[PDB]
Structure formats: structure tokens, C-alpha cells
Enzyme design. Sequence first.
Site, PDB file in Angstrom:
ATOM      1  N   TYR A 171       0.839  -1.200   0.000  1.00 20.06           N
ATOM      2  CA  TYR A 171       0.000   0.000   0.000  1.00 20.06           C
ATOM      3  C   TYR A 171       0.865   1.237   0.000  1.00 20.06           C
ATOM      4  O   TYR A 171       1.706   1.412   0.863  1.00 20.06           O
ATOM      5  CB  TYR A 171      -0.983   0.009   1.185  1.00 20.06           C
ATOM      6  CG  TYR A 171      -1.880  -1.202   1.188  1.00 20.06           C
ATOM      7  CD1 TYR A 171      -1.453  -2.407   1.732  1.00 20.06           C
ATOM      8  CD2 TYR A 171      -3.126  -1.167   0.584  1.00 20.06           C
ATOM      9  CE1 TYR A 171      -2.257  -3.539   1.699  1.00 20.06           C
ATOM     10  CE2 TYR A 171      -3.941  -2.295   0.546  1.00 20.06           C
ATOM     11  CZ  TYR A 171      -3.505  -3.479   1.109  1.00 20.06           C
ATOM     12  OH  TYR A 171      -4.296  -4.599   1.067  1.00 20.06           O
ATOM     13  N   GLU A 177     -11.222  -8.484   8.811  1.00 22.79           N
ATOM     14  CA  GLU A 177     -10.622  -9.126   7.641  1.00 22.79           C
ATOM     15  C   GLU A 177     -11.593 -10.168   7.060  1.00 22.79           C
ATOM     16  O   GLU A 177     -12.498 -10.620   7.759  1.00 22.79           O
ATOM     17  CB  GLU A 177      -9.296  -9.798   8.018  1.00 22.79           C
ATOM     18  CG  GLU A 177      -8.236  -8.857   8.569  1.00 22.79           C
ATOM     19  CD  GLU A 177      -7.641  -7.890   7.570  1.00 22.79           C
ATOM     20  OE1 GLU A 177      -7.305  -8.320   6.442  1.00 22.79           O
ATOM     21  OE2 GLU A 177      -7.450  -6.709   7.941  1.00 22.79           O
ATOM     22  N   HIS A 226     -11.626  -2.491  12.373  1.00 22.56           N
ATOM     23  CA  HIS A 226     -10.643  -1.413  12.283  1.00 22.56           C
ATOM     24  C   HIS A 226     -10.908  -0.545  11.088  1.00 22.56           C
ATOM     25  O   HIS A 226     -11.559  -0.975  10.142  1.00 22.56           O
ATOM     26  CB  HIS A 226      -9.203  -1.937  12.266  1.00 22.56           C
ATOM     27  CG  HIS A 226      -8.937  -2.982  11.227  1.00 22.56           C
ATOM     28  ND1 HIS A 226      -9.178  -4.321  11.479  1.00 22.56           N
ATOM     29  CD2 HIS A 226      -8.422  -2.855   9.979  1.00 22.56           C
ATOM     30  CE1 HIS A 226      -8.824  -4.963  10.377  1.00 22.56           C
ATOM     31  NE2 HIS A 226      -8.363  -4.122   9.444  1.00 22.56           N
ATOM     32  N   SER A 282       0.941  -5.838   3.742  1.00 23.43           N
ATOM     33  CA  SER A 282      -0.069  -6.580   4.512  1.00 23.43           C
ATOM     34  C   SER A 282      -0.385  -7.971   3.953  1.00 23.43           C
ATOM     35  O   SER A 282      -0.224  -8.205   2.761  1.00 23.43           O
ATOM     36  CB  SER A 282      -1.359  -5.761   4.600  1.00 23.43           C
ATOM     37  OG  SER A 282      -1.968  -5.825   5.882  1.00 23.43           O
TER      38      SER A 282
HETATM   39 ZN   LIG Z   1      -7.918  -4.787   7.663  1.00 25.44          ZN
END
Ligand SMILES: [Zn+2]
Length: 337
Positions: free
Chosen positions: A162, A175, A261, A273
Site C-alpha cells: 500500500y 478481515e 478497524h 499486509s
Molecule cells: Zn484490515
Amino acid sequence: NPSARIMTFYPTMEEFRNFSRYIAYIESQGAHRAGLAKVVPPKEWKPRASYDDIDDLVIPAPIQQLVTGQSGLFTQYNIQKKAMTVREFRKIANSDKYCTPRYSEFEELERKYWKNLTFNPPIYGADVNGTLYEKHVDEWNIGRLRTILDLVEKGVNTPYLYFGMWKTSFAWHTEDMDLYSINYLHFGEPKSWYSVPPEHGKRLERLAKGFFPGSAQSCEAFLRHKMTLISPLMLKKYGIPFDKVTQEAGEFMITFPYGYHAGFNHGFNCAESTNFATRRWIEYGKQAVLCSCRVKISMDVFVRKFQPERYKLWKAGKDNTVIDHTLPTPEAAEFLK
Ligand SMILES: [Zn+2]
Ligand SMILES: [Cl-]
Ligand SMILES: [Zn+2]
């Protein structure tokens, strides 16, 4: 951790060497109760020697993030842009149009974030398939964590980069498959995070359903679209318990199963990630409410290897198990005694 506050860990090189083991340890300390935790790697540890050679790296799908909304409630629309290099992005990020405003305390930059998020839509160099880790680095390699998640292989086990700029943000979500996630800030300006303890995730879900009924009637798990933005002042007003943390370059962030989150980027930065699992996650994955309209993993493989007793019961739909969010991973046995 009865307060369920975001915990910070400073592992020594010996502690750090094993990932799943440290994840077990942090859990024994009750880190998972917050939904989010910070890990500071030993001073000696560097995943890459120099980040100077990545200027000609390609961001294939840059997203101009358009936000619409008022009084603490917003919706982010991701307008895909033409592929651009890290050099093209860094020049935009640092430009007078898109650079970070002047500020003193973090409280000031946050205030400014929530005032201006709807104006001057930034570009986010999100979901870039790749890694900045050097081949040889064995400790905490996002590309190869060697968690129980690898059983799927036997493409969410792969790392994504990112490239952020000021005001780029990530909406409220857990997630996919309610998994764990690791986020390393390679270099650049900080990344600020907001977290809702998994024990209160259903209160956020309830709140979100109230505000976006159209969205809720169209998809049961609409927060999974990663489009919903909710101000901490709105969470405070509706009594949703949350916490905030700022991750700085060279720090790790761990998100736990069902740990909602959201957050934003301070300025030009890069973070890697991926998703991972522990034995604890298996019930989270089995129970997970998925997105209908529109990542899905068949739990069978995991239920055959780790829950053989409950396998025939679950296949039938008789496994009426109730998830205890306060409970640490079985693996934390050696650290709980
Ligand atoms: Zn996340
Ligand atoms: Cl201000
Ligand atoms: Zn959906």
C-alpha cells in the site's frame, strides 16, 4: 486486559525469531481483546536494506477515493485510475495539492482529517501484489509467515503493498473470513488506526445497520465492501467502545479475528499486509458472516485437521459453539502456565 486497550510489545531478537509463537505470547497477555496490537521489532532487524530502488515499481490500480457524507457518517467510492509508478505517486503525494497539512499534535491532524475527508479526493496505491522484504529475511516475512493458513494451499496467503498519501483512508471492516492480519510500515509518514474490541463488534454492526438500511437490506455483511467511514465522535455519541493508535515507520500492526478497524494515512508512506491464522481463528472462520453480492475459504479442511470430534456434528449443522472473544489461542499454553 480487562480494559481491552491497544497493547504495544517490544520483543527481543530471541522472542521475535518465531512469529506464531510470539502471536501466541501476545495473546496470553490479552492483546486480542483490543482487536488491534502494536509490535516494535528489535533495533537490528531490517526487512530490506534500502527503499531507494523501488521508484520504477508499478502500482497497477491506483484508487481515487471519493468520500460522500456528513456529521461523522460517510461512504467512500473507489474510482480506479490508470497504472502509475511509485515515482509518479510520490510526486503527487508530496505536491502542494495533496501534501500533509501543518500541524502540532496528532489531535490536530485527526480533527483536520474528519473535517476535510470529503474534499480534494486523494489517490491510494492500494492492493499492489508484491513484497518489499529481501529473500533471505526469515523473521516475520509477510510473504511466508508459515501459519496454519497455508493448509488452504495443500490467493489471500500472498502479500499486498500500500502506497499512501495524506487523507487516504480505510473503512470500517474485519478481515475476510474474520482472519488475522499483519501490517508493516516500510517507510514514510504514520498510519493512524481505530479499533472496536471483538466483544463489541456486534454493537458497531448494529449501529452501521441503523445508518445504512439500504446497504443492509442489499447485503447482510455490507461493511465487508470496505466503504463505510464512521467518526470516533459518532462512536462516542452512540456509546461504541473503541481505541486509537498511530503506527510509525518500521512498526507492525496485528488485527485479530473479528477486530473491526479503520484508519487513514498521514502522508506519503508504504505498508505491506497479508492474512494469517491460529487454531483460535478456526471457530471465527466457521461462524463468519460473509458478503453475498461479491474472498471465501471452505472450513472443511481445517475442521478435519483440528476439530475432528466436532466434524460430523458441524457438517450436519449441529455445531452450536459460541465464540468467547476474551479467550486466548490454545497455542498460548506454554505462556499461560
Ligand atoms: Zn484490515
Ligand atoms: Cl483544529
Ligand atoms: Zn455484499
